[PDB]
Ligand binder design. Structure first.
Ligand SMILES: NC(=O)c1ccc[n+]([C@@H]2O[C@H](COP(=O)([O-])OP(=O)(O)OC[C@H]3O[C@@H](n4cnc5c(N)ncnc54)[C@H](OP(=O)(O)O)[C@@H]3O)[C@@H](O)[C@H]2O)c1
Ligand SMILES: NC(=O)c1ccc[n+]([C@@H]2O[C@H](COP(=O)([O-])OP(=O)(O)OC[C@H]3O[C@@H](n4cnc5c(N)ncnc54)[C@H](OP(=O)(O)O)[C@@H]3O)[C@@H](O)[C@H]2O)c1
Ligand SMILES: NC(=O)c1ccc[n+]([C@@H]2O[C@H](COP(=O)([O-])OP(=O)(O)OC[C@H]3O[C@@H](n4cnc5c(N)ncnc54)[C@H](OP(=O)(O)O)[C@@H]3O)[C@@H](O)[C@H]2O)c1
Lengths: 474, 474, 474, 474
């Protein structure tokens, strides 16, 4: 077993204890990652705080450079990383490589967006005559040490989207990847080491969050917690954060609202691509379709067919639907499938599980009484809820505790815009599937789908504070 | 008993229980405010939530017109409200009227700043050539129900600063003034009532924070908590907030760094005003002078001299130093004073307390051993700490858990900017006492001094989220 | 004859020579305006320049107060001023009052928009590491003396649209209204004089442009020339401006592109309103309908009918169509009508001219060989051109030397956006008549329709410049 | 002879005629450049206009990629190009290399700054309630064909600073380098050619500016003229621009204001570097020192010494002072030296001219009566003017018809700022020599020093317009 080390204060370290990582699809052993001790966690943080001042004293262009190099390295090794990554989280090899390319892109972009952050000069005279000679020179500054924590479905991409924005602004990082993905995370950590950033600027932490999780979050060394993951852990992070700044990208139950005048063929393709992408293990996936009755039968039919075209199989074969992350997860989905069924839902696709590989199932005639109408599966299961009016679609849509994104399919644009304003989500895509898509675009969840606004530009803004220097003109 | 009432969903309501409020200076009864029950709190939030949609559906200019109407009413009644506020929190009459005027100004300014908030249009083609025809139309939206909590030292001003920004953006309000100052808060409600805002858009909650504070804060109807008060309560707010956004303005121990080249007269004049305004009961007060040894003697004598010119007395006489808010505080301050004296600090004034009226006291040669060096007094007690370099002054300054604002008196502006970057504070004033001064300016606190960035423009930004609508161009 | 006086350096001055103004509709004498000498113009500019420094020395808020005051005065006198305006430019009384009200709104809006202009702080370290301590504090400053020249169709509104934005930023104004409209212009001046703006900050000039026009514009005292008029004069001013900044709002031949999926009823209402508003004497009027052959017939009929419901008559009666500004215009318009009629266009209405009152005429099947297809009429004449594709409509549209605004009537917005990108105009309205509408919006013309970007905020940035103060932080 | 070709429509073309360019220092034949006919210019534009649409159709990131490549080419061949450039305009070989590096830097930066241009969404409801559902989606668009004309002192740098911002935004360029510098210009063109930018996107025009000058500018294909050169040709470009947008970077007489409390050694070093850089052949440069009598003798002496340390000679030997660009300029400068001399000026340095090489001369006691006090020499001659008050220094400084930049040397910053507000210039450097310094900073001149605001970000803004799409939400 290859025993990986954590990049800490400019060195690769192991821990007295470790964790063995396996392949969800095969079961093969990929290696082990350290299981840090609070003492070791304390070292990572003590290291970062000590390097922060020097890292911040650098010019924006110097930090941008280190970051571009990192991206250069990731592009160079997009094959090695994708290889492991693909195996570590059972993600299609091609898409796995793509995630690394997406990561490189986000890093380069953040580097360039961040070196152009500008300040403001406010006039006292705008508020009171007596203060006309008083001005405020407001410049942005880092919050200090940022604790980045990534999910299993994008251990690298959702690591960089937090790290790059943090570093360019002058913050130091403590990256805790998901255990089931800790290898991929350490591979990313490799690029940062090779790039040669100063020791302590970028560090990693591994170990089941189920034992050092609260510790790394509650540690007073952290000035900001940027997290993507379950809504459950999200809640707790919010409470442990106290009054400290936080970034939370949690679950979602994105609805696809289909009006009578929609382009059913296009709607169907988008709903297919979004719902089943990566077996439904995507936060922004199309997890529920709210379709008008008059066009339901036809739409459903289109979906069904296109579902059959999906490729069921293993990661190395770039199959649309691959084995779910783990057994627990698959069991969860099955529970939702059984509940939908017993209550009347009609499965138009075959319900079938083999290992942790669940075949894509299309549930029609789903009602708000079924768990599947609400709970986030994170498995290939798409329920279809029929409505008799846009207004109903709005209610059912907002009734959810989730509000990441929503889709609206219709040809009546002005109306879609009106409906978008009413949806309790961050982003509404018109005649397209939901997606974080275009990382410069803002990405945020409403209600229990998140806290804070992501998207390169917004992430930088989020992980920086302001320092205002006021004086009077003579 | 003159019984004041809360403004709830367009009507004035008493509660089965009340709390008698007395003048801190004279001890005379001022009236009573309701001691709301949780049921009543529930009805307030329910009211605000039910009113939010219609309030948001209005145009910005319409919401603006309402705020201007409130501001005009406050200006018209500046003598009325000022007179009572003066008595309720033992604040000079003139500065009390002044507090009201400043409130109308904030209200007016928020109305205009907010009616012209703009959205952005992002290019998908900026990130990937493949999305060149995809654009993101991003517009600001209200977060919902905002809970505003003001402090005793500015029950009206620090209410308007949260309320107007919140309301202009389309949020609805629940205003909880401090108990000692609740009558002033209810007088402010009068202005919103007379202005005619739709029932539910604006509401008040009164009652002992030690008995309904947790409840009004932990309530899930609250989408955002904007609070100004003690760090202790502030911390609890942070945790009770969970993942919900917050605005915290807390304690402060603003240091005034005085270099060898500082204009000692200007420095003493500024330090006297900032340290003793309203008897030191200010968050942005100059609460500790870090001055180079070589100019200490001269500076200290200028302070001592000006301190003795401060008037001591009653609010109606517009005295500089008035009785402290209550007995607990006067005790706490006197204890800080005695601890200094007993530990050896060099007192430049006689230690004197008449009831809750503590005469301005100045302690020179205070050491890091003395409580007065760190604890926020919120009384007219000013410590002087002699340093032998800017490096040390910066260390002492940052040693504090507070980091609201800082003053730097020197003639070397480039150096002042260098020092400013090192000081862990929100704002740094050069050759001027610290101050929230000019409300368009950002107002924030580092470390334990706060969370979030205030100042009209920033408050609106803080209490709004973004709604991103994405679509492809044909 | 009531002798009107120009307002110069805080004084109401007459001129040795006067120009009599007659009511276009009745021919009745309305009064007379001064006929300044080149030297009297020199005194206007000398005063302005002399008062500029002290005007700029004021705080932003103080200048805003003066403007707000002017606005209030105009609201109070809307009827008084409106009545004269109506008589002077043959604009319907009600819409004449509307111009005044709209003017106060712009004045007020510019006031609040202008006091909120902010500065920027640029980091040298964004460009080169060696300059990481160098920062640029950039703040806006006025350009100096601004010459504002308004048009006859909005002598007051297109006056304030330039004046207020210019004054708030700290510039001084020399306002030259149109001779036929000067009385209204001077009435506006009254509102400034009464507002009590410092002498010389605001001034007026009157005289035949065909005599002192080149002078007022060529005078080197003028720092910025903000103009709205004919493309002919507009170009002369362009060359006379030299390298000095300018604002040109010129002619337009806004086209209304009607696709096959357009709501024809809504399409017809908008075409009629935008085409015949003020008898077509609008720069943003609908002046040519490019409609797909298949819906041509149906659309044409809807229009023909709506045109007939238009009231025709005198301004005092608020008639839709009133006498044109002068006999020259009426002659020219008739000439364009006869050319179309003689060349074969299909008139859907009768040709009828009574004095300078031309009845609303509609020509269908207008070909590219007919003058009415390109020349801006500025009369109640509307050409309807049939096309066979969107590509053709786009071609006919851009072939024009004009490019102010355009309208697209369709049920497909994404396509409308793609077409808008192709149209060489400033603003594209979807399912709505073209319009300068909502003055905070940008207003600009491509090709020969204008230079510079108007709209309150943009006007302010146009008539201000930047002052960059660069220094190094120690 | 070494004959260069123009890069037209993606091909290298010669003309029936040509112009031979000789090394300003050795008089050797560097080579020849085409002397295009008007018909050949017509082809360059017809080609550019033809490629424009497809160039714009590309995504922002794609256009940025092309630019980055061009920058890469330049860095690879920096020595190859610096060699030729150094020879073409007789400038130190090292700085000739730096100019190329600076060019690559601006190009890379422009591509990144420009790929992030964002639009705005304006709310109708901000101006009137009736238009609350009306919004304006405002996006930036390129003006079309941009004509770039660079100066002799920076044939490469001041070309890229116009081309890149222009191109990234979607415009096509027609680059007209100065005859004396056309070889370098064409060398740059090679990088663009090797980068593979679509034919017609980037084109070059060579020929005597006195022959084809007015033609290329007046040509109607040009939508924008971005020019850097003499105030003389600038004024003409102004008129010939008509109403089309223009960017003018003309000459300057940057004053260096020295106060009594300045750091004379620091001041002097700065003045030496700024006034004599590139033999003073720079638009931004200390061309006049306005120093308080009090420290004039001391400052003068320091400058005097530092002048003697300056090297004299060939560009190949990186001498500080090189031969002026041509006989004419040297004749002109010498004339200024004589007028100043015959009027009383004291030359503290040997007035010596050998060929077109003038030794650095420092003139003391220069009065406002000497040509040298006002005219831009573009030679190694520094006049010194003794003033007795800041007020005077401000008055003299502003009496200049130039207003590019200024320098204030003092330790009283609040005062420096106050003074900077009064100086009629674009940028004011405190305790630093004037410079375009750090290209992201704004760069502009007042009065006769320019028109438009440069600096990467501002250049892009300048060469783009706006397209506004308005519609009503439903
Ligand atoms: N109730 C629901 O609706 C729902 C929905 C989806 C998932 N889940 C839960 O999520 C898990 C599997 O799904 P998932 O992998 O996407 O989610 P998850 O593992 O819960 O995601 C939480 C992320 O936070 C880290 N973490 C765990 N405990 C932490 C703590 N105390 N403090 C800070 N960080 C901590 C984890 O690291 P490690 O990887 O090292 O543990 C993990 O990367 C299961 O336990 C499942 O029950 C619940
Ligand atoms: N932790 C510290 O560092 C610190 C320092 C100085 C003073 N204090 C405490 O502050 C008080 C006097 O100073 P102060 O008036 O400036 O501060 P404070 O009273 O603590 O200010 C807190 C404000 O929040 C309200 N509040 C109280 N408990 C709350 C809760 N659980 N949830 C939400 N809101 C709550 C209060 O309303 P009511 O007015 O109705 O109570 C008060 O207006 C004393 O009780 C003192 O012990 C704490
Ligand atoms: N309506 C039509 O169909 C039509 C057709 C052809 C020509 N016209 C001509 O257009 C004019 C009426 O239309 P309009 O008012 O919209 O356009 P315009 O009068 O051309 O508008 C130009 C504005 O600039 C002023 N001005 C005149 N000469 C100037 C100069 N040399 N330099 C600077 N400013 C100058 C004018 O003032 P004054 O008011 O003092 O002139 C007027 O306010 C008449 O002159 C008419 O002969 C009209």
């Amino acid at each position: 077993t290859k025993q990986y080390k954590n990049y800490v204060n400019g060195e690769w370290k192991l821990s007295e204890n470790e964790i063995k990582i396996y392949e969800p699809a095969s079961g093969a052993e990929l290696g082990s990652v350290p299981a840090m001790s609070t003492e070791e966690v304390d070292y990572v943080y003590a290291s970062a705080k000590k390097a922060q001042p020097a890292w911040r004293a650098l010019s924006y262009i110097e930090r941008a450079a280190y970051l571009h190099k990192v991206a250069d390295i990731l592009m160079r090794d997009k094959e090695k990383i994708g290889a492991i990554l693909s195996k570590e989280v059972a993600k299609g090899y091609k898409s796995a490589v793509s995630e690394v390319v997406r990561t490189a892109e986000i890093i380069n972009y953040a580097a360039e967006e961040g070196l152009r952050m500008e300040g403001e000069v406010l006039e006292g005279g705008s508020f009171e005559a007596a203060s006309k000679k008083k001005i405020a020179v407001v410049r942005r500054e880092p919050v200090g040490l940022v604790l980045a924590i990534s999910p299993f479905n994008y251990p690298v991409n959702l690591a960089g989207s937090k790290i790059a924005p943090a570093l360019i602004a002058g913050n130091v990082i403590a990256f805790k990847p998901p255990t089931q993905g800790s290898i991929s995370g350490l591979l990313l950590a490799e690029a940062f080491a090779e790039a040669g950033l100063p020791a302590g600027v970028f560090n990693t932490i591994t170990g089941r969050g189920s034992e050092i999780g609260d510790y790394i979050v509650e540690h007073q060394a952290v000035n900001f917690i940027n997290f993507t993951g379950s809504t459950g852990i999200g809640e707790r992070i919010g409470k442990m954060a106290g009054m400290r700044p936080i970034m939370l990208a949690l679950g979602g139950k994105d609805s696809a609202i289909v009006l009578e005048d929609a382009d059913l063929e296009l709607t169907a393709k988008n709903i297919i691509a979004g719902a089943f992408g990566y077996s439904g293990q995507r936060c922004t996936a199309v997890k529920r379709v709210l379709v008008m009755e008059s066009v339901a039968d036809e739409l459903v039919e289109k979906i069904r067919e296109k579902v059959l075209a999906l490729t069921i199989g293993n990661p190395e074969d770039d199959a649309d639907i691959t084995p779910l992350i783990d057994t627990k997860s698959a069991d969860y989905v099955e529970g939702l499938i059984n509940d939908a069924n017993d209550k009347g839902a009609t499965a138009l696709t075959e319900i079938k599980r083999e290992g942790n590989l669940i075949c894509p199932i299309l549930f029609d005639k789903v009602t708000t009484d079924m768990r599947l109408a609400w709970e986030e599966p994170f498995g290939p299961v798409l329920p279809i809820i029929r409505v008799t009016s846009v207004e109903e679609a709005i209610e059912i849509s907002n009734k959810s505790e989730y509000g990441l994104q929503a889709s609206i399919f219709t040809n009546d644009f002005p109306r879609a815009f009106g409906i978008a304003e009413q949806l309790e989500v961050g982003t509404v895509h018109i005649n397209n599937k939901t997606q974080r898509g275009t990382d410069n675009f803002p990405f945020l969840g409403a209600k229990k789908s998140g806290a804070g606004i992501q998207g390169v530009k917004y992430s930088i803004e989020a992980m920086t504070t302001v320092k205002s220097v006021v004086f009077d003109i003579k």
